[PDB]
């Protein structure tokens, strides 16, 4: 059954238990932004 | 290629000497030295000047501070000696030739001494050249009257020159000679203390073993001053794409936020 309407999905649906793991690639550790910051010594370009 | 083999070939192309030939060469250089001092006192000119001009003439025009006209005019000025004085010139020239021949013959002793100083911050050829300088000095100050072998007196000068070169050229940031030998003695004491204790000594043990006037702060300061800088091009990570300088920011130029 669809939770938004209460009407059934028009066809039978495969349903069952699955083993699922969380991977260490998390958005918390990857989101990054910069306006201005430190620069390199020689090229005077932004650091990485 | 392989310049060490080329230098070894050139050095082996000159044959060795026997005791008789060695003493003959040393006697000739000694008499040449006596001749140049005799000439200098006779004419009243600086012995260094006349020695340089005489050796310049012995070498030839191939060896270009003294204009050619100057040295030639001095050479003609020494052609005004009546007799018993041109003998001084001839003895001096033969002595200079003896000096050259002896140095060429005994450069192999320099090689033999320097081959056991590798792996201390200087390449083998640099060690060989500094040993050659030391050998020239030893030839300059050798006295053959004592019947001692040439190598006995030459070895000390060669080793002194080599050790001075290690002390003076091994580090990108120059450290004076006394501090260098202090650091070497500190390291030797540390290794003996490690051998005896069975572990890395603490600063207290090293200070105690140094003697009076040495405490832990002093050994710590010495060890801090003895650190050599690392390269800005040191590879960081497994892949060949990151250098050390990629992690070093500039703190001198003002930031855009600071400038406003």
UniProtKB/Swiss-Prot annotation, chain A:
Species: Thermus thermophilus (strain ATCC 27634 / DSM 579 / HB8)
Protein name: DNA-directed RNA polymerase subunit beta
UniProt family annotation: Belongs to the RNA polymerase beta chain family.
Subunit text: The RNAP catalytic core consists of 2 alpha, 1 beta, 1 beta' and 1 omega subunit. When a sigma factor is associated with the core the holoenzyme is formed, which can initiate transcription.
Biological role: DNA-dependent RNA polymerase catalyzes the transcription of DNA into RNA using the four ribonucleoside triphosphates as substrates.
Curated annotation (Swiss-Prot), chain B:
Gene designation per UniProt: sigA
Keyword Flavoprotein attached: no
One of the protein's GO biological processes: DNA-templated transcription initiation
Functional description taken from the UniProt entry: Sigma factors are initiation factors that promote the attachment of RNA polymerase to specific initiation sites and are then released. This sigma factor is the primary sigma factor during exponential growth.
Cellular component GO terms, alphabetical: cytoplasm
Family: Belongs to the sigma-70 factor family. RpoD/SigA subfamily.
Alphabetic keyword roster: Cytoplasm, DNA-binding, Sigma factor, Transcription, Transcription regulation
Region Sigma-70 factor domain-2, annotated ranges: 102-172
Subunit structure: Interacts transiently with the RNA polymerase catalytic core formed by RpoA, RpoB, RpoC and RpoZ (2 alpha, 1 beta, 1 beta' and 1 omega subunit) to form the RNA polymerase holoenzyme that can initiate transcription.
Residues included from the entire protein: 78 to 345 of 423
Compartment(s) where it occurs, according to its Swiss-Prot or TrEMBL record: Cytoplasm
Residue numbers spanned by region Sigma-70 factor domain-1: 1-36
Domain notes: Contains 4 domains, connected by flexible linkers. In the active conformation, the domains are in an extended conformation, each making extensive interactions with the RNA polymerase catalytic core. In the autoinhibited state, sigma-70 factor domain-1 packs closely together with sigma-70 factor domains-2 and -4, contrary to the extended conformation that is seen when the protein is part of the RNA polymerase holoenzyme.
Extent of motif Interaction with polymerase core subunit RpoC: 126-129
UniProt protein name: RNA polymerase sigma factor SigA
Principal subcellular localisation of the protein: cytoplasm
GO MF terms held by the record: DNA binding; sigma factor activity
Region (Sigma-70 factor domain-3): 181-259
Entry annotated with the keyword Zinc-finger: no
């Amino acid at each position: 059954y669809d939770g938004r309407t209460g009407e059934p999905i028009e066809g039978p649906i495969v349903v069952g238990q699955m083993f699922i793991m969380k991977l260490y690639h998390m958005v918390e550790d990857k989101m990054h932004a910069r306006s201005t910051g430190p620069y390199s010594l020689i090229t005077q370009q932004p650091l990485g | 290629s392989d310049p060490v083999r080329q230098y070894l070939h050139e050095i082996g192309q000159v044959p060795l000497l026997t005791l008789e030939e060695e003493v003959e060469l040393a006697r000739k250089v000694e008499e040449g030295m006596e001749a140049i001092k005799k000439l200098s006192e006779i004419t009243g000119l600086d012995p260094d000047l006349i020695r340089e001009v005489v050796r310049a003439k012995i070498l030839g025009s191939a060896r270009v501070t003294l204009d050619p006209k100057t040295v030639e005019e001095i050479d003609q000025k020494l052609k005004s000696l009546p007799k018993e004085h041109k003998r001084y010139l001839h003895i001096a020239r033969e002595g200079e030739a003896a000096r050259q021949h002896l140095i060429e013959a005994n450069l192999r002793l320099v090689v033999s001494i320097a081959k056991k100083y590798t792996g201390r911050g200087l390449s083998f050829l640099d060690l060989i050249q500094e040993g050659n300088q030391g050998l020239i000095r030893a030839v300059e100050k050798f006295e053959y009257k004592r019947r001692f072998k040439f190598s006995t007196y030459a070895t000390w000068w060669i080793r002194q020159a080599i050790n001075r070169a290690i002390a003076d050229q091994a580090r990108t940031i120059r450290i004076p000679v006394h501090m260098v030998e202090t650091i070497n003695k500190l390291s030797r004491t540390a290794r003996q203390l490690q051998q005896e204790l069975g572990r890395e000594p603490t600063y207290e043990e090293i200070a105690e073993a140094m003697g009076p006037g040495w405490d832990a702060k002093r050994v710590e300061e010495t060890l801090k001053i003895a650190q050599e800088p690392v390269s800005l091009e040191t590879p960081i990570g497994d892949e060949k794409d990151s250098f050390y300088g990629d992690f070093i920011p500039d703190e001198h130029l003002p930031s855009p936020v600071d400038a406003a």
